[PDB]
CSV table of C-alpha atoms in Angstrom, one decimal:
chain,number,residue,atom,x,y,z
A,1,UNK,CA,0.0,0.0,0.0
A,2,UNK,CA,2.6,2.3,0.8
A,3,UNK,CA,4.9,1.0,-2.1
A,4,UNK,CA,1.3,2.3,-4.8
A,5,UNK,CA,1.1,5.3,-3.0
A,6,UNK,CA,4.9,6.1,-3.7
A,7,UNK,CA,4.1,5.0,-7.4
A,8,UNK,CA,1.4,7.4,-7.5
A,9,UNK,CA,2.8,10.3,-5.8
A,10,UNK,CA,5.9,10.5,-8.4
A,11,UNK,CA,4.2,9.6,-11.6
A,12,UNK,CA,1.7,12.7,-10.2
A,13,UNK,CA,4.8,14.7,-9.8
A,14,UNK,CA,6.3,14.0,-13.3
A,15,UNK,CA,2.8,14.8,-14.7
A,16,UNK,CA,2.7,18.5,-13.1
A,17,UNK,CA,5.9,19.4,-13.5
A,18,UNK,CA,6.2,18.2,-17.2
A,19,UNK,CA,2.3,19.1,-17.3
A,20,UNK,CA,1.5,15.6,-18.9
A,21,UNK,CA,-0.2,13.3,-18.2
A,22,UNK,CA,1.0,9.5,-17.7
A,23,UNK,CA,-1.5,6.2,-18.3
A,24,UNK,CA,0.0,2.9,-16.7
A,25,UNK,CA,-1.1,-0.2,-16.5
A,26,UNK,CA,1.2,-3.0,-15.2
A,27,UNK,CA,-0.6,-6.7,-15.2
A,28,UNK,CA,0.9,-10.4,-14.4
A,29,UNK,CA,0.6,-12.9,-17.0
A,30,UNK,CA,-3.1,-13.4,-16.1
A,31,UNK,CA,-4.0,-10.2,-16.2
A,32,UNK,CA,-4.3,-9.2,-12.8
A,33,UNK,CA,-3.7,-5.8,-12.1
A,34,UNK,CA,0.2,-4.9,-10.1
A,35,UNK,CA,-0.6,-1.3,-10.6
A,36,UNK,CA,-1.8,1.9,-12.8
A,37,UNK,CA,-2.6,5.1,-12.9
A,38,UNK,CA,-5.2,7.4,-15.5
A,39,UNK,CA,-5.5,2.9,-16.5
A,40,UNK,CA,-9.0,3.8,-17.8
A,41,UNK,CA,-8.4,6.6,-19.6
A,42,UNK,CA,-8.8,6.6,-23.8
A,43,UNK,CA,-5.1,7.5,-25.3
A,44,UNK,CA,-4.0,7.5,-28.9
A,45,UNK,CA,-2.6,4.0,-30.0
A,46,UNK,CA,0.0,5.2,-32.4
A,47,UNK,CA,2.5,3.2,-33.5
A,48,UNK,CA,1.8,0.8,-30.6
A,49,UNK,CA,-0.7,-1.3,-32.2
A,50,UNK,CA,1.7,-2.9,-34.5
A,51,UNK,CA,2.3,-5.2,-32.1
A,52,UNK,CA,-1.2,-6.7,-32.1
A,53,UNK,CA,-1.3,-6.3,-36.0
A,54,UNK,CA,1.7,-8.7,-35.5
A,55,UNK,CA,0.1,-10.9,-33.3
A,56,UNK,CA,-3.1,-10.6,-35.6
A,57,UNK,CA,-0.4,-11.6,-38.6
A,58,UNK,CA,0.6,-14.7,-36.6
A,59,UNK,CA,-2.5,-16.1,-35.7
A,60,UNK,CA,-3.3,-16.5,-39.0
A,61,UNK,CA,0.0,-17.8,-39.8
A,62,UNK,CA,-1.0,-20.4,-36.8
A,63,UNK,CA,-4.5,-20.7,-38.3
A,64,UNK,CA,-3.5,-21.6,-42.1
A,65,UNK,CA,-5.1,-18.3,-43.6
A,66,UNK,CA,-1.9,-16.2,-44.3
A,67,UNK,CA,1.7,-17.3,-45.4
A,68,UNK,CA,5.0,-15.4,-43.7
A,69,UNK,CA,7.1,-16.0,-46.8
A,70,UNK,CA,3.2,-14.8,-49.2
A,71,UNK,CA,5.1,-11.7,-51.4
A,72,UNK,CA,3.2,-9.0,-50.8
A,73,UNK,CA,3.8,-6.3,-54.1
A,74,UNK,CA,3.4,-2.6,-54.0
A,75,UNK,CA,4.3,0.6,-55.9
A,76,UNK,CA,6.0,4.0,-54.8
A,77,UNK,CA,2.1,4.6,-54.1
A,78,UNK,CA,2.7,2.8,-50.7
A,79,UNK,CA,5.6,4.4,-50.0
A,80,UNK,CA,4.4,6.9,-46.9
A,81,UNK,CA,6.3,9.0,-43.7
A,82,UNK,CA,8.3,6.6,-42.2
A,83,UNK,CA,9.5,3.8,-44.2
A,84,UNK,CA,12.7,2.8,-44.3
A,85,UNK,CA,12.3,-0.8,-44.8
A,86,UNK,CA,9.3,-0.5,-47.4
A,87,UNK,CA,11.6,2.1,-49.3
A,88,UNK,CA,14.8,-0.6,-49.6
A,89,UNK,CA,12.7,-3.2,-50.8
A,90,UNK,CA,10.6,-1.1,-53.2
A,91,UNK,CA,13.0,-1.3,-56.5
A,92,UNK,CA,12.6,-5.6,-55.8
A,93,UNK,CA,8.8,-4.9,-56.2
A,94,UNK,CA,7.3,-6.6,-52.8
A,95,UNK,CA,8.2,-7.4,-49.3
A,96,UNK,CA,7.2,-10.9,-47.7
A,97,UNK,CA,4.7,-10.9,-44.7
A,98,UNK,CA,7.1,-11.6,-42.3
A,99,UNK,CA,9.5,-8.9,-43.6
A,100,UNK,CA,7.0,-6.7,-43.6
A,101,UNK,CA,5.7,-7.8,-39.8
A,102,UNK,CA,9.3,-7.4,-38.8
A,103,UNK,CA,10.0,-4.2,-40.1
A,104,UNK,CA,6.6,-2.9,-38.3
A,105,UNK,CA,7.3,-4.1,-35.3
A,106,UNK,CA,11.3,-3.1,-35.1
A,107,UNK,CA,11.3,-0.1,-37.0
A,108,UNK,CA,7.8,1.3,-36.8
A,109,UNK,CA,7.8,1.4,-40.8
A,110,UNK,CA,4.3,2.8,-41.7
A,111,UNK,CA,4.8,1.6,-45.5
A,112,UNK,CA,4.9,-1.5,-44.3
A,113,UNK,CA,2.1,-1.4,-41.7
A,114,UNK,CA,0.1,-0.3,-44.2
A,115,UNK,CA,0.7,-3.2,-46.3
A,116,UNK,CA,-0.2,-5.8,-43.6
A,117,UNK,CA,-3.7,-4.0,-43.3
A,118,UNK,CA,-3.9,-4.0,-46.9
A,119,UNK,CA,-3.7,-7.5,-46.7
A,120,UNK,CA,-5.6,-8.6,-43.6
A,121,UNK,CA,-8.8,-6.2,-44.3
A,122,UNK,CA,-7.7,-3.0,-42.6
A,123,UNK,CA,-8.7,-0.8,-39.5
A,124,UNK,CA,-11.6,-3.0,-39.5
A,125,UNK,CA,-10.0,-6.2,-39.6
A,126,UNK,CA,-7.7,-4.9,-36.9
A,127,UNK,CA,-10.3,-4.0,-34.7
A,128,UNK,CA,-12.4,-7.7,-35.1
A,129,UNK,CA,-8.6,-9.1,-34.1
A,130,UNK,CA,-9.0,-7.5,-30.5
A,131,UNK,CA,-12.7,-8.2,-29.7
A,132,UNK,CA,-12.1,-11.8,-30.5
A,133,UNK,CA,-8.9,-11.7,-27.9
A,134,UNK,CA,-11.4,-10.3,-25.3
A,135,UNK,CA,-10.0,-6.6,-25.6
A,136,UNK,CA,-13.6,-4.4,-26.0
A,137,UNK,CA,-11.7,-1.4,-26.0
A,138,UNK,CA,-8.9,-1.3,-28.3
A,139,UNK,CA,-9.8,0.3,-31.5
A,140,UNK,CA,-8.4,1.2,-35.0
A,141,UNK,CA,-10.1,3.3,-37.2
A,142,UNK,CA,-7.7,4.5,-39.7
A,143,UNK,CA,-4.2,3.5,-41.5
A,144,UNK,CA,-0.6,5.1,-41.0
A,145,UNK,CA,-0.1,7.9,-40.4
A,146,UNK,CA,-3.7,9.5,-39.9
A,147,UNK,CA,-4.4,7.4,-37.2
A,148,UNK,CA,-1.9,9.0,-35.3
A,149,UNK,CA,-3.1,12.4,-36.0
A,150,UNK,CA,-4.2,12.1,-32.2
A,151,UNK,CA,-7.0,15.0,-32.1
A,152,UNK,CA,-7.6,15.9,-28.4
A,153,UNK,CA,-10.9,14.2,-27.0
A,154,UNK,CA,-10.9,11.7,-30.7
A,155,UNK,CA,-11.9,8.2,-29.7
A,156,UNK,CA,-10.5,6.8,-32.5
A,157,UNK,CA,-7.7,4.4,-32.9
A,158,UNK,CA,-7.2,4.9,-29.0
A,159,UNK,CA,-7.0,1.7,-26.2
A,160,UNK,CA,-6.5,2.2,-22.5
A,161,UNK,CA,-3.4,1.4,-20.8
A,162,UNK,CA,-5.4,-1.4,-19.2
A,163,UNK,CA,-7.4,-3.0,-22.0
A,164,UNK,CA,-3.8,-2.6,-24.1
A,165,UNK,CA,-2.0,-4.4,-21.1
A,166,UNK,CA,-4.4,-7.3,-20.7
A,167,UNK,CA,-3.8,-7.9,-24.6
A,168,UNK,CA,-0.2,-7.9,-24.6
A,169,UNK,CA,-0.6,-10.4,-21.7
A,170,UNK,CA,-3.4,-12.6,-23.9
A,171,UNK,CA,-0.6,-12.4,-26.7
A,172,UNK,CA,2.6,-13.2,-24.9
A,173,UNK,CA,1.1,-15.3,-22.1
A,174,UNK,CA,-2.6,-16.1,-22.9
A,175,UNK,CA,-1.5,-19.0,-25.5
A,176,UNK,CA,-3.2,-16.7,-28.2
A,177,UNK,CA,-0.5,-18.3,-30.2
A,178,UNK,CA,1.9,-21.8,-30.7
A,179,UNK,CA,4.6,-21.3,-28.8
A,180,UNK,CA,6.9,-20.9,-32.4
A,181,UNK,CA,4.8,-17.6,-32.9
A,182,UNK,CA,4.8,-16.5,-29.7
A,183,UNK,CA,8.8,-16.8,-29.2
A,184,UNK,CA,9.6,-15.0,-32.2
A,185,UNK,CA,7.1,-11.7,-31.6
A,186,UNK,CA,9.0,-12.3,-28.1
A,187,UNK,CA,12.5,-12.0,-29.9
A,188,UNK,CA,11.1,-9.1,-32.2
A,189,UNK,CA,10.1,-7.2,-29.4
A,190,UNK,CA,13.3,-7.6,-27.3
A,191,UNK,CA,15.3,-6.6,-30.4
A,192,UNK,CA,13.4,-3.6,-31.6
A,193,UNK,CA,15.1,-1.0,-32.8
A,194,UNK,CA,13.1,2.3,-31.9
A,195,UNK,CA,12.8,2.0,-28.2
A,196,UNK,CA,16.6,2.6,-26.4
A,197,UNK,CA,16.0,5.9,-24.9
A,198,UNK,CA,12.4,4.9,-23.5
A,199,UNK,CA,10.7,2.4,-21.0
A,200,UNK,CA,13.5,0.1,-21.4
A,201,UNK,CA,16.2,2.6,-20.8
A,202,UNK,CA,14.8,3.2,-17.0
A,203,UNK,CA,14.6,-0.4,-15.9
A,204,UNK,CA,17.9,-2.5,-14.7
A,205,UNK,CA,20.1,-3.3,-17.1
A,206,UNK,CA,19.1,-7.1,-16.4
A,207,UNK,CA,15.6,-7.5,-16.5
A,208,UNK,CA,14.3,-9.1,-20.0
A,209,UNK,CA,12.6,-6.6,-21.6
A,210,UNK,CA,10.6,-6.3,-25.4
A,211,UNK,CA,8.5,-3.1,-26.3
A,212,UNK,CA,6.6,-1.7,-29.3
A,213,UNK,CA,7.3,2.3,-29.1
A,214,UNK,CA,4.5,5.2,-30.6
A,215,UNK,CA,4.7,8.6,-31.1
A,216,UNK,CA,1.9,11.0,-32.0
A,217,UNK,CA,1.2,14.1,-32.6
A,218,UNK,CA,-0.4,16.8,-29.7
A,219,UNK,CA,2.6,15.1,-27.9
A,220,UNK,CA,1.7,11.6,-27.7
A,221,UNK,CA,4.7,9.0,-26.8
A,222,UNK,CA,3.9,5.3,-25.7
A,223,UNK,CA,6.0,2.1,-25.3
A,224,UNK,CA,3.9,-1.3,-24.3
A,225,UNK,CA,5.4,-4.7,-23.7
A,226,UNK,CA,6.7,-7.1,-21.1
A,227,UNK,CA,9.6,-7.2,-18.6
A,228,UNK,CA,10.9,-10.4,-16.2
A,229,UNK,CA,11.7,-9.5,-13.1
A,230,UNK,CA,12.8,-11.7,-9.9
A,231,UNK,CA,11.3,-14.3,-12.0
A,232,UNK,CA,8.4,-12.9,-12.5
A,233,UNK,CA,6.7,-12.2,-15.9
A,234,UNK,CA,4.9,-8.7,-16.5
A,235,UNK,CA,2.8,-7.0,-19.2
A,236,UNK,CA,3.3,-3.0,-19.7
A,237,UNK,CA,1.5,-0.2,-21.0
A,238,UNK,CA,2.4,3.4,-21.0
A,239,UNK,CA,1.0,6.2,-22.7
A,240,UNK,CA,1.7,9.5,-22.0
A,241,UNK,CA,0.4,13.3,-23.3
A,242,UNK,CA,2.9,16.5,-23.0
A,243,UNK,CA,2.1,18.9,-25.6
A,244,UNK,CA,4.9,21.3,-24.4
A,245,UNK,CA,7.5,18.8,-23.9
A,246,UNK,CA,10.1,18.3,-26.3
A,247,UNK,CA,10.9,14.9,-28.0
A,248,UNK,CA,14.1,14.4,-26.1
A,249,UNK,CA,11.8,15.4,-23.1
A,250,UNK,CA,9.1,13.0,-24.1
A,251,UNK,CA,11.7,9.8,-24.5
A,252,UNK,CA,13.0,11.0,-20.5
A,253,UNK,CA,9.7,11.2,-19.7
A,254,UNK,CA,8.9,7.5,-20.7
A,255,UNK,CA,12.0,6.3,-19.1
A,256,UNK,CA,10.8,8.1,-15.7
A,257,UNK,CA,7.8,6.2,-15.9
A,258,UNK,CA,9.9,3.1,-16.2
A,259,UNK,CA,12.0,4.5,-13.3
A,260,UNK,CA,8.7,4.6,-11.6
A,261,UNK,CA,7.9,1.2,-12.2
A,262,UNK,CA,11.2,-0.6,-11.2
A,263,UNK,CA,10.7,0.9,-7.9
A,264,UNK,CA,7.7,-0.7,-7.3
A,265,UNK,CA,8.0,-3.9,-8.4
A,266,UNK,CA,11.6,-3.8,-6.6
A,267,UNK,CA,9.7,-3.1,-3.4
């Protein structure tokens, strides 16, 4: 009790003095709430539900309705903000589904986002993907990078830090996939590219740790994922909102949080 009181008092004191505020939600591989703060409150996905487009890519690996090494062609058309990967590979004329997963998930490459939706059905598709993993909340409405335009008080293509935790969990832990699928979105997420100054870079340097950063507009930066601790399995969400912050600001920000969060669980 006095160990969520300390949480909340200094995530409270990052959010006034960086005027931002910080949703949390930390859950054990069941689900079960460890802690949270704002856990209930809508924020813009961005580039974090490329994860669960992942996992959505996956399970239909596991299911027989999509092929990793299916060559999925495109055109400069596809080309958008963002894409390094989808830019190397546009000359060959296609990237596979799994080069394309990976490069979403590691590098955040819209281009290549945007070709997974193309091919699973799009926002809509996405969205069926989390109701049938139990996650009500989750939502995306629109393809990169509109969908992170991240309006204030626009419900679309937002989650909650706890409906986006529980679904992390359900992915990694839940048995939402075989265990081949599951350990290599593990792998992808420990090796990702985008997220060494954010959560990971505040927890010790030897906890297992694999995150999916975002960043939006009107301030927006998020980083979901899981971390082992003492032996002990978690899934993370964090998104935060500081309009007047910086982006260097914003990545210190997210690393406070995960400050924030080794302390508890430490204690």
């Amino acid at each position: 009790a006095s160990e969520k009181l300390t949480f909340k008092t200094d995530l409270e004191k990052l959010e006034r003095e960086k005027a931002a505020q910080i949703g949390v939600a930390i859950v054990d591989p069941q689900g079960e709430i460890v802690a949270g703060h704002r856990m209930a409150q809508r924020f813009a996905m961005c580039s974090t539900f490329k994860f669960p487009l992942a996992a959505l890519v996956f399970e239909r690996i596991d299911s027989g309705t999509e092929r990793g090494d299916r060559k999925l062609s495109y055109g400069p058309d596809m080309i958008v903000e963002w894409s390094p990967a989808t830019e190397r590979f546009l000359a060959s004329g296609h990237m596979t589904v799994l080069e394309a997963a990976q490069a979403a998930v590691q590098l955040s490459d819209n281009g290549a986002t945007n070709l997974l939706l193309r091919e699973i059905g799009g926002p809509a598709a996405m969205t069926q993907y989390f109701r049938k993993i139990g996650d009500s909340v989750s939502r995306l409405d629109r393809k990169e990078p509109e969908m992170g335009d991240n309006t204030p008080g626009d419900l679309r293509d937002t989650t909650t830090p706890i409906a986006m935790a529980r679904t992390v969990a359900k992915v990694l832990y839940g048995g939402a996939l075989t265990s081949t699928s599951t350990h290599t979105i593990e792998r992808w997420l420990i090796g990702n590219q985008t997220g060494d100054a954010t959560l990971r870079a505040g927890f010790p340097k030897d906890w297992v740790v694999g995150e999916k950063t975002g960043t939006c507009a009107n301030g927006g930066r998020n980083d979901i994922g899981f971390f082992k601790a003492q032996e002990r399995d978690y899934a993370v969400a964090v998104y935060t909102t500081a309009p007047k912050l910086s982006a260097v600001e914003r990545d210190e920000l997210v690393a406070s949080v995960g400050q924030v969060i080794t302390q508890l669980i430490l204690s």
